[PDB]
């Protein structure tokens, strides 16, 4: 009922901003939806908020083929074997030397006083392959903006204001954290659909309106008739529950000829409108990607899309990305690209026919049930729940564990070391520094709690498995050049449970 993951990596931290805090904004001209205002800091931070920074692919398979659920319990974070190097360039040459006197400053924001940026799917975690060395990402944040300008409530945080720890070669950093009680992630699909929970052998004792008019000579006549639903009119049965909420997405095909020849990446997107500006909803509320036998379709911005190894940043073709699909939840959640259902629109009578409408948006109703989005090996683990008065079912929409008090941001930076100062006093700000960077090891150890699978089903289940045939390269391995790659996205719903 427990599994402990441990990951050690080698990081390199450069000096950012040349030690300065700078105001950054879109003040060079942007659309209203793209304006921002914030600060880039000289600090770097540690990001291990992806499952692959902790689970090897084999570990993931062991987890998903055998457990109905799992959730994080505690973590231990360490920084050791730290070394600062000074870089001096003379006559077009580069010399690097060790400085045992310089330090590195480590600030752990355990009181959540700084804007939390982990939880926004940024690229800079411990690499999935343990032999990769990574550059620590620069910490920056955004505040309130009115166009490219700031407003009075806009905040400015200076990190030196807080007490940090100084580390020189030989010193090490340790930090232990306990996760709060959070629900287990559901690593299973349902073997029953919400509209098929009845006993197909017995009729219901309840009636439903089955006919409205009946033959009357040569034409019809209004006459209400009722029936009890059994297996032959299973769609008409009385039920106790409703499918989860929806916020309709546009449907696109993995086959380019099935799509319209126009630009609707934005004009046809599902958006939310906040303080005058639009944002793409992505991935929105947990919905099924497609209905049975339509595996080629997916929600315009309703699924997590990962890049294949070496994929570029912009206007990459569909073969360069790995589109996930949440068809497992189609048993309780609506299909992302279709209406939630239909609803009555008028009042019928002798000279007016019953009219109905499709509902493309459906907020939660009493009696609704649903499954949250799946987590992936290369996806997010947690997110900080926004500090607000109300937050309904705080499960991060990208997937994962919503936490009030998430693992705190661990910020780090190289202490500035002034270059040769003048021999006459100058009040001017020191602007010449000795070029340097640090490097060291980082290890993250997370303890996970498990809910062992205990199915009493008779036939065999579905399990995640490698392809038994021959191949030039093995999946989740390094190629002939030493490059590690993750060939596909691996979800967590293989095992099955009933509804």
């Amino acid at each position: 009922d427990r599994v402990i993951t441990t990951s050690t990596r080698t990081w390199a931290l450069p000096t950012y901003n040349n030690h300065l805090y700078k105001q950054i904004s879109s003040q060079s001209g942007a659309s209203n939806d793209n304006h921002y205002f914030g600060y880039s800091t000289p600090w770097g931070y540690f990001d291990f908020n992806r499952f692959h920074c902790h689970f090897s692919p084999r570990d993931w398979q062991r987890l998903i083929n055998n457990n109905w659920g799992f959730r994080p319990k505690r973590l231990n974070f360490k920084l050791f074997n730290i070394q600062v190097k000074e870089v001096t360039q003379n006559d077009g040459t580069t010399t690097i030397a060790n400085n045992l006197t310089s330090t590195v400053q480590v600030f752990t924001d355990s009181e959540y006083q700084l804007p939390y940026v982990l939880g926004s799917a940024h690229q800079g975690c411990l690499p999935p392959f343990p032999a990769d060395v990574f550059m620590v990402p620069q910490y920056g944040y955004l505040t309130l903006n009115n166009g490219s300008q700031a407003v009075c409530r806009s905040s400015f945080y200076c990190l030196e204001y807080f007490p940090s720890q100084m580390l020189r070669t030989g010193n090490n950093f340790t930090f232990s954290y306990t996760f709060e009680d959070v629900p287990f992630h559901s690593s299973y699909a349902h073997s029953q659909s919400l509209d098929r929970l009845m006993n197909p052998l017995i009729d219901q004792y309840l009636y439903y309106l089955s006919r409205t008019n009946t033959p009357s000579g040569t034409t019809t006549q209004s006459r209400l008739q009722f029936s009890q639903a059994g297996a032959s009119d299973i769609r008409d049965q009385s039920r106790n529950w409703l499918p989860g909420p929806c916020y309709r997405q546009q449907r696109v095909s993995k086959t380019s000829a099935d799509n319209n020849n126009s630009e609707y990446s934005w004009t046809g997107a599902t958006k939310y409108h906040l303080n005058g500006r639009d944002s793409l909803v992505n991935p929105g509320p947990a919905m099924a990607s497609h209905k049975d036998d339509e595996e080629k379709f997916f929600p315009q911005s309703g699924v997590l899309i990962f890049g294949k190894q070496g994929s570029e940043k912009t206007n990459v073709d569909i073969e360069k990305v790995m589109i996930t699909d949440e068809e497992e939840i189609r048993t309780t959640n609506p299909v992302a690209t279709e209406q939630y259902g239909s609803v009555s629109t008028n009042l019928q009578r002798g000279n007016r026919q019953a009219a109905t409408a499709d509902v493309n948006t459906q907020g939660v109703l009493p009696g609704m049930v649903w499954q949250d989005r799946d987590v992936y090996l290369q996806g997010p683990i947690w997110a900080k729940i926004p500090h607000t008065d109300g937050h309904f079912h705080p499960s991060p929409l990208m997937g994962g564990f919503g936490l009030k008090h998430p693992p705190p941001q661990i910020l780090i930076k190289n202490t500035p070391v002034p270059a040769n100062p003048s021999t006459t006093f100058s009040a001017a700000k020191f602007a010449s520094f000795i070029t340097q960077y640090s490097t060291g090891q980082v290890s993250v150890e997370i303890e996970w709690e498990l809910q062992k699978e205990n199915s009493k089903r008779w036939n065999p289940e579905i399990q995640y498995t490698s392809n038994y045939n021959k191949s030039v390269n093995v999946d989740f391995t390094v190629d002939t050049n030493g490059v590690y790659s993750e060939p596909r996205p691996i979800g967590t719903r293989y095992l099955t449970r009933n509804l």
């Binding site: 003040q27 001209g29 209203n32 939806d33 304006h35 166009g147 300008q149 609707y264 004009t267 639009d278």
Partner: protein, 95 residues
């Protein structure tokens, strides 16, 4: 400040019948500060009644008869500075 820059996603709309509705996106218009006004205008086109002349970022054209169209988008600054850009639309009859 610098004047705003008007931008339109599609500049050569090629929509034919029976499809009668197309769309022009102007939400990409950008400027140092923020844009406070969007103004669409049909400079020319088939003599009809269904005109839009609206103040939205994304223009929705419907009930389009065959012919050639030209729409001028004008964005306004917070200072009052403006800029315009033209869009082309062609509605062909069925084949």
């Amino acid at each position: 400040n610098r004047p705003p820059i008007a931008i339109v996603s599609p500049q050569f709309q090629e929509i034919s019948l029976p499809t009668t509705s197309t769309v022009i996106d102007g939400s990409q218009s950008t400027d140092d500060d923020k844009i406070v006004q969007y103004h669409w205008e049909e400079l020319k086109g088939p003599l009809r009644e269904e005109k839009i002349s609206e103040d939205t970022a994304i223009l929705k054209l419907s009930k389009l008869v065959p012919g050639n169209y030209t729409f001028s988008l004008t964005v306004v600054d917070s200072d009052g500075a403006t800029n315009s850009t033209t869009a082309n639309l062609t509605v062909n009859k069925a084949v």
